[PDB]
Ligand binder design. Structure first.
Ligand SMILES: *[C@@H]1O[C@H](CO)[C@@H](O)[C@H](O)[C@H]1NC(C)=O
Lengths: 50, 50
């Protein structure tokens, strides 16, 4: 600010603004399935075959 | 930081070919045949040579 009635009447407003908005989302999904089946039903050769 | 970890292990012998969505029942009712020797006892074969 400034004022006077004799020699020095002025005005000033050196207003400033600095804003910096930074976001950082970071998502990481990971799925891993493994599944295994087994069956048996056995068979032998007869001990007297030719 | 989420982390599921699921296991599963059926081990059947012996009924109808198992599958995950099977009830604990349709297993049983389907045991009509599909029987399996779950326990056994015998003798040394030299005993049978008489
Ligand atoms: C698996 O993770 C989900 C979230 O995605 C959770 O709700 C659940 O309880 C966890 N376990 C199973 C068996 O789904």
């Amino acid at each position: 600010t400034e004022l006077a009635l004799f020699s020095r009447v002025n005005g000033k407003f050196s207003t400033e603004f600095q804003r910096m908005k930074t976001l950082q989302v970071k998502d990481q999904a990971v799925t891993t399935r493994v599944q295994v089946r087994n069956r048996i039903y056995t068979v032998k050769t007869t001990p007297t075959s030719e | 930081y989420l982390s599921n970890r699921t296991n599963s292990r059926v081990q059947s012998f012996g009924g109808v070919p198992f599958y995950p969505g099977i009830t604990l029942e349709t297993w049983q009712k389907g045991i009509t045949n599909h029987l399996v020797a779950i326990d056994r006892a015998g003798l040394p074969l030299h005993f049978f040579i008489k």
